[PDB]
Structure 1
Amino acid sequence: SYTLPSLPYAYDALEPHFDKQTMEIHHTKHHQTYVNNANAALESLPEFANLPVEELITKLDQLPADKKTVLRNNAGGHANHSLFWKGLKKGTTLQGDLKAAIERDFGSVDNFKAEFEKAAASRFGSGWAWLVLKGDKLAVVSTANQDSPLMGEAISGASGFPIMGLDVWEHAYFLKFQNRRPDYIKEFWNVVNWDEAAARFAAKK
């Protein structure tokens, strides 16, 4: 079964950029709820219940017809939030092989940032913006609700290994930013954990 993961920091570690009350709520309520609803759906699927969530969401089409939606949504939610927390940290510097590949695939870091901001802002309703690795090339993609590019193009409309990503569901920014998702997106650059993105790139490039 799944559990709510412990975090790489206290809820206040991303201040003054991301507010600690949202961090706490986001973890103990929203993420906890995906874990709980996934666990309920997995109760009758002992074979699938053993998989890592990040693997299960690559295998949705193998589930029973009546379980696919609820696990796409909840396992997706669990996988995406588990990744998200790892990708937040202050004080990092984009550098090394990851910086070089971003420059290569988008022309410059600023270009990538503009493209990422645009995908994040233009995702209408709930969803995520991502930096994915598609074989030998990095790309910016977005998905709806709790879909993940790990689910594949057919299900999610995107594909690739997520290097990093931004939650743009309203619960992630309402308290501090209300409807100003662009302001939230700007603050994200101060807490993007480039060290984690770098480690993930190193594992997969």
Structure 2
Amino acid sequence: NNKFKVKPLPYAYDALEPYIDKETMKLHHDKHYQAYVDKLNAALEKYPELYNYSLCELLQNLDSLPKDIATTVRNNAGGAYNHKFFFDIMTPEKTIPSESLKEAIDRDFGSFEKFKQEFQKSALDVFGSGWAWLVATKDGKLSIMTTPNQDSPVSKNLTPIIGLDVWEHAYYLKYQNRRNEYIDNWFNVVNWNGALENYKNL
């Protein structure tokens, strides 16, 4: 069975309290993330060789996939990739920026505080469903960008370093309309060591 699979949550479902509630972690991982994976697998039954593509390969070739599944793959491979990435980029452990990522942030944004203010504003300003990202070009230059729905920077040859889900399902149970509070609290759980590994993998 080479079908796509849901990666088990890398920590306990209540591990990110009180910043993200356990009930939301359960729904977000066990229902939403699961649905993207199930729908993706369903769409590829017609073209089983695509089970041998990685999620990244699917996202990098949306415009050359067979026409009848291009959109469903964009949405569901997007959802699967983004959520796996998102749960991996959070942690109950205490972490801080270090090494080349720490330096790159200062280089490209001036300081960590300036980077943080820009990321928070970009996340706050996403209209509708979507994501805010810290991304790197192939040469390691950092920038902040957003994507709508489950679109991914990977599709634009940009490599995600950290990313924040601002679909309302990600924050409504605890924060309701107060997305600003969700965004601010999320920085307490960002896994900077994972972010560093993402940056090093260029």
* TM-score normalised by structure 2 residue count: 0.95
Aligned-pair distance for 1:107? 0.4
Query: Alignment partner for residue 117 of structure 1, among 116, 120, 129?
Result: 120
Aligned-pair distance for 1:54? 2.1
Deviations, residues 117-163 of structure 1 (Å, cap 9, x unaligned): 111011100000000001331000000000001112xxxxxx51001
Aligned-pair distance for 1:8? 1.2
Give the match for residue 144 of structure 1: 148
Aligned-pair distance for 1:14? 0.7
SS of 2:43's equivalent?
helix
Alpha-carbon distance between aligned partners in 2 of 1:20 and 1:51, rounded to the nearest angstrom: 33
4+ runs deviating over 2 angstroms: none
Give the match for residue 155 of structure 1: none
Give the match for residue 168 of structure 2: 170
- Amino acid paired to 1:165: G
Deviations, residues 20-72 of structure 1 (Å, cap 9, x unaligned): 11001100100010011111101111121211212211111121112111110
- Amino acid paired to 2:185: E
SS of 1:38's equivalent?
helix
- Amino acid paired to 1:117: Q
Deviations, residues 159-180 of structure 1 (Å, cap 9, x unaligned): 5100110000000000000011
Alpha-carbon distance between aligned partners in 2 of 1:56 and 1:70, rounded to the nearest angstrom: 11
SS of 1:12's equivalent?
coil
User: How do residues 151-190 of structure 1 correspond to structure 2 at under 5 angstroms?
Assistant: 151-152=155-156, 159-190=157-188
Give the match for residue 9 of structure 1: 11
Give the match for residue 61 of structure 2: 59
- Verify: 1:101 aligned to 2:104, yes or no: yes
Give the match for residue 88 of structure 2: 86
SS of 1:164's equivalent?
strand
Deviations, residues 99-121 of structure 1 (Å, cap 9, x unaligned): 11000000000111111111101
Alpha-carbon distance between aligned partners in 2 of 1:119 and 1:57, rounded to the nearest angstrom: 23
Aligned-pair distance for 1:13? 0.9
SS of 2:187's equivalent?
helix
Give the match for residue 198 of structure 2: 200
- Amino acid paired to 1:115: E
Aligned-pair distance for 1:94? 1.5
Give the match for residue 156 of structure 1: none
SS of 2:7's equivalent?
coil
- Amino acid paired to 1:22: T
Q: Which runs of 5+ in 2 are unaligned?
A: none
Alpha-carbon distance between aligned partners in 2 of 1:145 and 1:200, rounded to the nearest angstrom: 22
Give the match for residue 135 of structure 1: 138
Q: How many residues align?
A: 198
* TM-score normalised by structure 1 residue count: 0.94
Alpha-carbon distance between aligned partners in 2 of 1:200 and 1:93, rounded to the nearest angstrom: 14
Identical columns (%): 53
